[PDB]
Amino acid sequence: ATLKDQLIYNLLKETPQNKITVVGVGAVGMACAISILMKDLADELALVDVIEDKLKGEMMDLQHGSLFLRTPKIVSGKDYNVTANSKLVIITAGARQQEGESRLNLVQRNVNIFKFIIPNVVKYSPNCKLLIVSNPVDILTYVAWKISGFPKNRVIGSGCNLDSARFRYLMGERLGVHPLSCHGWVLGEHGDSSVPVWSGMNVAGVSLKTLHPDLGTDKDKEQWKEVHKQVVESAYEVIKLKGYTSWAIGLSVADLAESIMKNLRRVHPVSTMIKGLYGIKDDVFLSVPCILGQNGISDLVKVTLTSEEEARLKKSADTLWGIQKELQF
Amino acid sequence: TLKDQLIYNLLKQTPQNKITVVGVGAVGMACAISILMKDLADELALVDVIEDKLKGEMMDLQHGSLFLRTPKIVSGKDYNVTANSKLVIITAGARQQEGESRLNLVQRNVNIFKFIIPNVVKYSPNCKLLIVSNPVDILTYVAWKISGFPKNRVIGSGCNLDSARFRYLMGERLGVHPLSCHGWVLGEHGDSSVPVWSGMNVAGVSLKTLHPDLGTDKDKEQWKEVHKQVVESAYEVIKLKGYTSWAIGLSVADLAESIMKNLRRVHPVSTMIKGLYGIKDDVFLSVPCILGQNGISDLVKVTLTSEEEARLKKSADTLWGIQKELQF
Amino acid sequence: ATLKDQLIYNLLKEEQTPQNKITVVGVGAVGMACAISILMKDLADELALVDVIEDKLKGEMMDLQHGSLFLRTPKIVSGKDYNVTANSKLVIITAGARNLVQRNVNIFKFIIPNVVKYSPNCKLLIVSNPVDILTYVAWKISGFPKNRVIGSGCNLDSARFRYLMGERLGVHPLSCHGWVLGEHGDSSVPVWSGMNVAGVSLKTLHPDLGTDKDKEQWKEVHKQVVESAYEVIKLKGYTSWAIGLSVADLAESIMKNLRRVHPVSTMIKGLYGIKDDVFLSVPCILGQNGISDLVKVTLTSEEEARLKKSADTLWGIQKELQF
Amino acid sequence: ATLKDQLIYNLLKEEQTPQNKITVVGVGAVGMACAISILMKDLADELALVDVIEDKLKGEMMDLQHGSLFLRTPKIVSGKDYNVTANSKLVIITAGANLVQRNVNIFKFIIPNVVKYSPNCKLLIVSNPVDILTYVAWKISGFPKNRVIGSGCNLDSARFRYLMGERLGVHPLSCHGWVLGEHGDSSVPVWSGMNVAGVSLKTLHPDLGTDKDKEQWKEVHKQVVESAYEVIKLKGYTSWAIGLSVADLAESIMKNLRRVHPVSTMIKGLYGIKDDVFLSVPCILGQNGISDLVKVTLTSEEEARLKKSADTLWGIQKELQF
Numbered sequence A: 001a002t003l004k005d006q007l008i009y010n011l012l013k014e015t016p017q018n019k020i021t022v023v024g025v026g027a028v029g030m031a032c033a034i035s036i037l038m039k040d041l042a043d044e045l046a047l048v049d050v051i052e053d054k055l056k057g058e059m060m061d062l063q064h065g066s067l068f069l070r071t072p073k074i075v076s077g078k079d080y081n082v083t084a085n086s087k088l089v090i091i092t093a094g095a096r097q098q099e100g101e102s103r104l105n106l107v108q109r110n111v112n113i114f115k116f117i118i119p120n121v122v123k124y125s126p127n128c129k130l131l132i133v134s135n136p137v138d139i140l141t142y143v144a145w146k147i148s149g150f151p152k153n154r155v156i157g158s159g160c161n162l163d164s165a166r167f168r169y170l171m172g173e174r175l176g177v178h179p180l181s182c183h184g185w186v187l188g189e190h191g192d193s194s195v196p197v198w199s200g201m202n203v204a205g206v207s208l209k210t211l212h213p214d215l216g217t218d219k220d221k222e223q224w225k226e227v228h229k230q231v232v233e234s235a236y237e238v239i240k241l242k243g244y245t246s247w248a249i250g251l252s253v254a255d256l257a258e259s260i261m262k263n264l265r266r267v268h269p270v271s272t273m274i275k276g277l278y279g280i281k282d283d284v285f286l287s288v289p290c291i292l293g294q295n296g297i298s299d300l301v302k303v304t305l306t307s308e309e310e311a312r313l314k315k316s317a318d319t320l321w322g323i324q325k326e327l328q329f
Numbered sequence B: 001t002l003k004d005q006l007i008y009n010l011l012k013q014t015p016q017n018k019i020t021v022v023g024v025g026a027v028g029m030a031c032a033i034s035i036l037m038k039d040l041a042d043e044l045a046l047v048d049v050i051e052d053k054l055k056g057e058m059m060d061l062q063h064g065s066l067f068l069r070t071p072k073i074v075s076g077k078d079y080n081v082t083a084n085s086k087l088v089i090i091t092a093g094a095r096q097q098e099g100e101s102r103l104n105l106v107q108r109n110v111n112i113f114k115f116i117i118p119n120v121v122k123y124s125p126n127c128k129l130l131i132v133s134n135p136v137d138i139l140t141y142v143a144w145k146i147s148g149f150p151k152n153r154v155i156g157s158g159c160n161l162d163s164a165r166f167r168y169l170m171g172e173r174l175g176v177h178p179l180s181c182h183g184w185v186l187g188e189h190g191d192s193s194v195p196v197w198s199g200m201n202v203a204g205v206s207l208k209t210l211h212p213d214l215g216t217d218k219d220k221e222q223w224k225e226v227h228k229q230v231v232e233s234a235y236e237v238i239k240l241k242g243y244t245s246w247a248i249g250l251s252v253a254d255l256a257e258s259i260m261k262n263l264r265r266v267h268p269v270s271t272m273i274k275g276l277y278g279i280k281d282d283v284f285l286s287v288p289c290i291l292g293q294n295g296i297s298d299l300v301k302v303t304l305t306s307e308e309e310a311r312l313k314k315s316a317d318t319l320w321g322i323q324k325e326l327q328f
Numbered sequence C: 001a002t003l004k005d006q007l008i009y010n011l012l013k014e015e016q017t018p019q020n021k022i023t024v025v026g027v028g029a030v031g032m033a034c035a036i037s038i039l040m041k042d043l044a045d046e047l048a049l050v051d052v053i054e055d056k057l058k059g060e061m062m063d064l065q066h067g068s069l070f071l072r073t074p075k076i077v078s079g080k081d082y083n084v085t086a087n088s089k090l091v092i093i094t095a096g097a098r099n100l101v102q103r104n105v106n107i108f109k110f111i112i113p114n115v116v117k118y119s120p121n122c123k124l125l126i127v128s129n130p131v132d133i134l135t136y137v138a139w140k141i142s143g144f145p146k147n148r149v150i151g152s153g154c155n156l157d158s159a160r161f162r163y164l165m166g167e168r169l170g171v172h173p174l175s176c177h178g179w180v181l182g183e184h185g186d187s188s189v190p191v192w193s194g195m196n197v198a199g200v201s202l203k204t205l206h207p208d209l210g211t212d213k214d215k216e217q218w219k220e221v222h223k224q225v226v227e228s229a230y231e232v233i234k235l236k237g238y239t240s241w242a243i244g245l246s247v248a249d250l251a252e253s254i255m256k257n258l259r260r261v262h263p264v265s266t267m268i269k270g271l272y273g274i275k276d277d278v279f280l281s282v283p284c285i286l287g288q289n290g291i292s293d294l295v296k297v298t299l300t301s302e303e304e305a306r307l308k309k310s311a312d313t314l315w316g317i318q319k320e321l322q323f
Numbered sequence D: 001a002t003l004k005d006q007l008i009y010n011l012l013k014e015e016q017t018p019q020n021k022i023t024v025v026g027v028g029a030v031g032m033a034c035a036i037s038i039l040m041k042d043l044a045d046e047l048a049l050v051d052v053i054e055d056k057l058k059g060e061m062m063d064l065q066h067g068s069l070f071l072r073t074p075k076i077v078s079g080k081d082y083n084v085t086a087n088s089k090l091v092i093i094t095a096g097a098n099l100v101q102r103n104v105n106i107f108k109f110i111i112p113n114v115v116k117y118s119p120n121c122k123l124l125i126v127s128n129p130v131d132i133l134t135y136v137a138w139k140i141s142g143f144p145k146n147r148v149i150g151s152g153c154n155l156d157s158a159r160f161r162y163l164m165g166e167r168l169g170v171h172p173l174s175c176h177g178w179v180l181g182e183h184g185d186s187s188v189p190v191w192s193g194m195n196v197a198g199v200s201l202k203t204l205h206p207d208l209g210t211d212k213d214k215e216q217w218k219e220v221h222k223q224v225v226e227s228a229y230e231v232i233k234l235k236g237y238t239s240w241a242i243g244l245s246v247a248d249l250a251e252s253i254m255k256n257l258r259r260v261h262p263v264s265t266m267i268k269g270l271y272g273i274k275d276d277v278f279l280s281v282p283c284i285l286g287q288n289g290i291s292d293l294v295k296v297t298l299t300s301e302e303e304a305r306l307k308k309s310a311d312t313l314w315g316i317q318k319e320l321q322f
């Protein structure tokens, strides 16, 4: 008999219980993978990409670290059979933006990628929650929702989670306080058009807007509006300096994955179907504070916005619908 | 100011558990993320020669602060940023191209070390040095010679990764988690590494006793192939993704953990093995070491078979050959 | 209107089934140490507590709930009725007052049918003493396959042994390997042949290891394991922290399907000349289906005889039990 | 030669100073809950335990030591002699016997013994009445106010957030609310700062925390007080919730996180308080203890409860001999 048979007596012959799939093993996908592995959120990790060499190499590199991890099974493949029975599927797959090329071009190029991915994911994990990271995240969340046929609670966009995370870091740096104790919400459209909700900004329940009524206005001597401007600046700066962003997004995604996998019911700024709110009548996804758990977005926090903040959200929803109506599905 | 209206200042201290990472490439950054997610430091310093990459990497880590428990992340080309580090991790250096040997990088990484090591020692004279840059065994010796530090404070990542990979492969063959599969890969980190077949066990049950052909050419199960798979492992990963990062990042954080927490765990790491196995030269290679707050305080004297001791001295002879032809 | 309705807009109605639920039966010193350790290791999305003393039970549940801000287990429940334990992945039995096998078999006769009724697919983790007999009792009453009925067995004995080994060598217990097998407690067997640091056999280096002609008296380390148990009980009246931690470690392998090897009590019929339905500790592979595999340890004639003697004793008691 | 010498080659002799040492004084239900929580959060490289009951102390130490295989704290020590506490970064006082003079007398022995072995430590006071006993520890130690911290309203605040969470169907982490002033019966819920995702509950419901409230949110604070008495009535004491809240404070101190916590501090100069009185306000907590304070703007009613508490505490404090 084999050494295995000489050493081990088998009792049982024969599904993963807390499986997570990462689609796209680029810099974002891999940072999501390592963060999830170090937070023990899954009993099985699946990786999918179209570049087979890179995919196998990334899987092997992770597997070689098994001794230091508590995720006993790490798999990869171009075939979505490796994703079967995932509780959560994270989409970080995307086309590399060409020089000159417009952003509407990239939208459709990523829609074409999504037209192949989403049916393959839903076929192997029909009851999964979809977590969209790929840009433009608000449009691609809508695309994922339309293709999948899933109820809106199971289609989550990373949205303004990173924007809010960056805002809190910058707030923290200005005040000499840990970002955990600095509260502030960046809502609406992820990226350039995001809305800092000045009314909600506080340390220990002390409203910064109450203490300083000029907060977030051009009338502000301290120019706190620059803290939101810097959120936008930092994204461009990181890309200019290292060519991409990975660690910050990976960490923010693992945080969302934690609330879903552990059914924590924490409130996060994530992209959801906001039709019926703030005068929005189109099928658009934008970030609002959402209760996140085992069934995805179960609830949403109704944030009271100023006329300016509400108009900004409306304008973003009109822009997103404009792109969404002209997409080829 | 709004800061003064909101916060009243009471006090107008040195970092207590500071770690520096030198070299922010794929290895350095994987070491950084692994250390950050294991809460090993109250302060993380990053050093590199590439300005842009350094600032970008620091900023990317800082933007994830909300999800971390390391309140201070700093970077700079000037080593004043590294002052009073408990542990300095060196990952700076030229890496293998597809198929290239680690010994081929020695000359240019030794020059890189001639600049780094004096700068690190100047700002952290009492730190422990953790060397990752390849060839790791020779570069650990180089760091030891340049620094003038006692041998206990100069640690090379060594065969820690080789042993982790071996245990993973053992685990996959037996259907057991690597944590429960015990086996030691010693000597040089690389082509001349030694799998110690005598110490391979699950729950104290010797695999060599149960299968006397273990690690021999007479083996029908070809267990010797598990070690070949360990030797080839970096070459295969380099061929597929162009470098290795995750596995080494994880193994370094494991060593950082034993040092920062003074655990006194036994790890296969690069060390001054003069006086052991008939070695009379200042050779650095992997043996099981007790790792704590003062680095390597103790060494485990592994009993090697005639053939296993042979293979280890072959590894030591190779490394000394390269080591001896070096001007400081 | 409610402030909840003014603040929160509901999207989903029906709240689903718990995915990673753990139940602790008996909220004594052992049960509560098991509970806090599992909570601080984030092994469960829901924790259920059961006891017969209703006031203590509610107080313990409330004390844990008040620490929620510092935890990642969003639901903590308790009750005398086993409906609170429904759909548990793992049920830990620490129930009964801390000779006493007959009163403990009788409470198991009430507890086990109640646990299996609400969680038919759970793994059973038995801690209550005599753990080896009570694991057999749980197996018989539940009707579960042997893989889903685990006794804490020699896990604590082995942990204590490794601690003492570590202290003697100046090495962390994690790097000190040694297995204490068979019957939990006084009759446990230290397997001297498997004792090592970095794969270096202590018995090979010192052939007198675990013998009376040993000048270093390493046999005393096992003697100290037994002595320490009595000492802790003499000094504080019970043991809680060490058993709590060891149980959370078992819970981790099970919940995370790690397939790590642990010294736990299992049905060892067919091994070491044992022909009866007896549960004794051997190294077991632990995962989502409980004990899927067992490590066949090579024992000396003396070590094998000690297990056979323990098996004859345990079967003697077991034979006379009525279910 | 010994098996240890045959197996291990020693490189270093000198084995010195613990880098991240924590001491727990009083191994009762509170002390032991603090100990296990700190051990499971890997906050220390060394744990020291002190008590007057020698048998219980050794038994508790041994029970923790037997769990070493599952921990990352390589050294657990105990003793009646404070030599075991030398060079602690943090010293947690949970020792205890109206009741104030009995505890003051216990503190007159403890605090000098702690300060001589760990002159640079931060003192974390849990023993009740925590606000008076934090003042007592500060007076006896002679330490600057930044290094003398009372657990204060940390537990009150945590309980409040738990109850808020249960009412809203939201995790306590996402439910924000501050309970300040005097720990216990006289604690002040700051209704203005209560929010979920920056949405002020008082703005949405102006009747929040008043008797005019049809939803009776004032009852959530009443329930915080009710729950403390209930837990004591049901199990005889509280341990897990306090051990966890202390471990959270220990984390921000040991890791220099600079997180904001409701803890007891010397509040002379604030809210018209002119006496040396300790009570809870949101404090920035790090490696030097309380480095900063958040100046919370309070209503007339909230400020009145806090000043009233300060007058009462000073009344007791002036009538104490030490």
Ligand SMILES: NC(=O)c1ccc[n+]([C@@H]2O[C@H](COP(=O)([O-])OP(=O)(O)OC[C@H]3O[C@@H](n4cnc5c(N)ncnc54)[C@H](O)[C@@H]3O)[C@@H](O)[C@H]2O)c1
Pocket: A023, A024, A025, A026, A027, A028, A029, A048, A049, A050, A051, A092, A093, A094, A095, A096, A113, A116, A117, A133, A134, A135, A136, A137, A158, A159, A162, A190, A244, A245, A249
């Ligand atoms: N939401 C956020 O805050 C945030 C932040 C940073 C980046 N991003 C986005 O995440 C995406 C990925 O970023 P990146 O840096 O990792 O890009 P990347 O180019 O490095 O990686 C993308 C990966 O997607 C893969 N891919 C392409 N087509 C695929 C397909 N049909 N199936 C599976 N995989 C496929 C590629 O092969 C590649 O490996 C981008 O769209 C980016 O804009 C979002």
Ligand SMILES: NC(=O)c1ccc[n+]([C@@H]2O[C@H](COP(=O)([O-])OP(=O)(O)OC[C@H]3O[C@@H](n4cnc5c(N)ncnc54)[C@H](O)[C@@H]3O)[C@@H](O)[C@H]2O)c1
Pocket: B022, B023, B024, B025, B026, B027, B028, B047, B048, B049, B050, B091, B092, B093, B094, B095, B096, B112, B115, B116, B132, B133, B134, B135, B136, B157, B158, B161, B189, B243, B244, B245, B248
């Ligand atoms: N098991 C192991 O020990 C192990 C495993 C994998 C890789 N490695 C080694 O780690 C090293 C780094 O690998 P990599 O993939 O990160 O290479 P990399 O090219 O991605 O990064 C190397 C970094 O070193 C920096 N650097 C060069 N000179 C420097 C200087 N004088 N000061 C500071 N920084 C300087 C570079 O600028 C670069 O950022 C290599 O030597 C590699 O072989 C070791």
Ligand SMILES: NC(=O)c1ccc[n+]([C@@H]2O[C@H](COP(=O)([O-])OP(=O)(O)OC[C@H]3O[C@@H](n4cnc5c(N)ncnc54)[C@H](O)[C@@H]3O)[C@@H](O)[C@H]2O)c1
Pocket: C025, C026, C027, C028, C029, C030, C031, C050, C051, C052, C053, C094, C095, C096, C097, C098, C107, C110, C111, C127, C128, C129, C130, C131, C152, C153, C156, C184, C238, C239, C240, C243
């Ligand atoms: N296997 C080991 O290594 C190990 C180590 C230590 C203790 N133990 C055992 O664990 C058990 C418990 O220890 P303890 O110190 O917590 O005892 P304990 O007396 O403090 O607590 C026992 C609890 O069981 C409860 N109980 C009694 N009947 C019950 C019933 N029908 N249903 C539910 N609960 C019931 C009691 O009310 C009590 O709360 C003992 O049998 C003890 O010997 C085992």
Ligand SMILES: NC(=O)c1ccc[n+]([C@@H]2O[C@H](COP(=O)([O-])OP(=O)(O)OC[C@H]3O[C@@H](n4cnc5c(N)ncnc54)[C@H](O)[C@@H]3O)[C@@H](O)[C@H]2O)c1
Pocket: D025, D026, D027, D028, D029, D030, D031, D050, D051, D052, D053, D094, D095, D096, D097, D106, D109, D110, D126, D127, D128, D129, D130, D151, D152, D155, D183, D237, D238, D239, D242
């Ligand atoms: N939110 C809070 O601040 C909070 C919550 C709960 C309890 N507490 C307080 O914590 C304290 C302890 O609670 P407990 O349940 O553990 O009490 P306990 O009676 O169980 O334990 C107290 C311990 O203090 C020890 N002790 C007495 N004198 C001592 C001395 N001179 N030196 C060292 N140790 C000594 C006792 O021996 C005993 O072990 C009480 O004052 C209690 O009110 C505070």
Ligand SMILES: O=C1N[C@](c2ccsc2)(c2cccc(Oc3ccc(F)cc3)n2)CC(O)=C1Sc1ccccc1Cl
Pocket: A097, A103, A106, A135, A136, A162, A163, A166, A190, A191, A192, A231, A232, A233, A235, A236, A238, A239, A243, A244, A245
């Ligand atoms: O950090 C980030 N790096 C990004 C990136 C990552 C790899 S290439 C580009 C990045 C950065 C700057 C503009 C930018 O513009 C876009 C927007 C959509 C699109 F399809 C392509 C580029 N994208 C993607 C992204 O969304 C973020 S977050 C961010 C972006 C802008 C403002 C504020 C925030 Cl918080």
Ligand SMILES: O=C1N[C@](c2ccsc2)(c2cccc(Oc3ccc(F)cc3)n2)CC(O)=C1Sc1ccccc1Cl
Pocket: C098, C129, C130, C131, C132, C156, C157, C160, C184, C185, C186, C225, C226, C227, C229, C230, C232, C233, C237, C238, C239
């Ligand atoms: O640490 C412990 N405290 C105990 C206890 C718990 C509450 S009151 C008594 C304790 C101690 C001594 C004998 C004792 O009696 C028994 C009874 C039945 C039985 F199967 C084993 C021991 N029980 C329970 C227990 O099993 C342990 S572990 C242990 C016990 C004896 C020797 C070695 C070890 Cl490792």
Ligand SMILES: O=C1N[C@](c2ccsc2)(c2cccc(Oc3ccc(F)cc3)n2)CC(O)=C1Sc1ccccc1Cl
Pocket: D099, D128, D129, D130, D155, D156, D159, D183, D184, D185, D224, D225, D226, D228, D229, D231, D232, D236, D237, D238
């Ligand atoms: O949970 C708790 N259990 C307590 C206890 C602990 C062991 S015996 C009594 C507890 C509870 C109720 C009143 C009570 O009264 C006292 C008695 C003596 C004294 F010096 C201070 C307070 N003590 C101590 C304590 O401070 C808390 S927290 C708390 C207490 C009251 C209201 C609100 C909160 Cl958050």
